[PDB]
Design a protein around this ligand. Structure first.
Ligand SMILES: CCCOc1ccc(C[C@@H](Cc2ccccc2)C(=O)O)cc1CNC(=O)c1ccc(-c2ncccn2)cc1
Lengths: 260, 263
């Protein structure tokens, strides 16, 4: 039966490659050197960044910290569509109750967003605009409160997550496992969701044993990261609320706010 | 093989220690709850008068809801002591840096407390006073705010956790796994903790495979429960903060205070 789990693993990797333009392998090459990205490490470099390279998530449409924070939201929305497309390639997903598909994505995309963002981070900063740029951790941390601490929690997670040394083929299955979570609020038919996830989990276990035979209990260690992920998401929602209640300079064009 | 042999010996050691440390097992709780016998019937507390007769029938201020809350504190402290005793039996634990031993218990005890409290619960209520009593979930909800909803999320977790149908032999290893968590804040020496947990995880994996061979991915499902646990603790802390502000006349136990401090 093992043949089916390997076919699924390959299937998911291929789809993952199709859906996500910037892979972990590509991002690592850039991050470590082997090539080159424009570095944003302060206000002047940010501005040159905008001018020479035109980071579309920083395009016109104000205060720097606010525009950066909004740029994050813009890219996040963009990423949701890549994930949605990936989801439809997971065997069984499209066959689920349509409301459940919506629910699974609604609750799953944030977890997936921060998982994949780790692929774009090291302890020193993060790749932006399709790897064209690299924004430093310290520059982000330097932003005025409450924006100074907005990315930092993701960096902390990424550093820990990245120590697992997962590759794209590992991540493709993990992301699938995240989407097929049977505990999302408001699901109408949990059974086929858990059944698909049980299959993904089997596929994930084998992939990790085959791909990382030396890494004892990697499967267990990866599953444990779900705690870290959800905590990051919860924490992000909490900040969004704060800045929405306080902060008076956040508004965009009403259609832009609707979109994002 | 020799490797599996060592993991089985580990599982046996932990189960043995668990039975030695925890006076009310899940096996006994279930026997009491399934109410199949004549010697183990609990007195059921479901309102005020039946409460008032409890204090007479069962052997354990002049207020009401504080009494239940403080009875619950006392039990929690007792549970910490049982769990601390169990921890010492986990191979390698007492050999760790002393500061890390404290840290591991500080963050681990409540996750374990709610994990094990599930054993004493069904959708209708919870065993109390070493199984001699049973307090209904509805009664607990009938309590004045903020007390009125301290337990509900525990009940919610329990019903879904209990669907895994774990037994004590499984639980002994799982709680060991929880304690030996290398990602507790402020740990000095993460590696030796992680090394211990890895072997515990191996033992847990094998245990579930042998004990529930028909239960697909039970190992993974169990591990995902650890985020449910973290979240219950999170809620409980905030609920406590609210209490400390509305109920200035209510004492909290010093041990519990220290555990929650800067958590
Ligand atoms: C009683 C309902 C649920 O039980 C909980 C619930 C939670 C915990 C752990 C929790 C306790 C706590 C309370 C307040 C502040 C801080 C902690 C925790 O430590 O987080 C234990 C327990 C265990 N409690 C008991 O066995 C128990 C013992 C005695 C009584 C009781 N005694 C007299 C009159 C009525 N009831 C009730 C309950």
């Amino acid at each position: 039966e093992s043949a089916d789990l390997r076919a699924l693993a390959k299937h998911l990797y291929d789809s993952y490659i199709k859906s996500f333009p910037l892979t972990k392998a590509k991002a690592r090459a850039i991050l470590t050197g082997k090539t080159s990205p424009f570095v944003i490490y302060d206000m002047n470099s940010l501005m040159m960044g905008e001018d020479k390279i035109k980071f579309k998530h920083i395009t016109p449409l104000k205060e720097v910290a606010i525009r950066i924070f909004q740029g994050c939201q813009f890219r996040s929305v963009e990423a949701v569509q890549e994930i949605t497309e990936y989801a439809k390639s997971i065997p069984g997903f499209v066959n689920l109750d349509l409301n459940d598909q919506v629910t699974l994505l609604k609750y799953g995309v944030h977890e997936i967003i921060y998982t994949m963002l780790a692929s774009l981070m090291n302890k020193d900063g993060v790749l932006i605009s399709e790897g064209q740029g690299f924004m430093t951790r310290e520059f982000l941390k330097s932003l005025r409160k409450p924006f100074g601490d907005f990315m930092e929690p993701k960096f902390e997670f990424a550093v820990k997550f990245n120590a697992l040394e997962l590759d794209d083929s590992d991540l493709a299955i993990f992301i699938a496992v995240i989407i097929l979570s049977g505990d999302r609020p408001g699901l109408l038919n949990v059974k086929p969701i858990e059944d698909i996830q049980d299959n993904l989990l089997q596929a994930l276990e084998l992939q990790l044993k085959l791909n990382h035979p030396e890494s004892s209990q990697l499967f267990a260690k990866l599953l444990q990261k779900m705690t870290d992920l959800r905590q990051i998401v919860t924490e992000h929602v909490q900040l969004l609320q704060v800045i929405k209640k306080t902060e008076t300079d956040m508004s965009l064009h009403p259609l832009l706010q609707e979109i994002y």
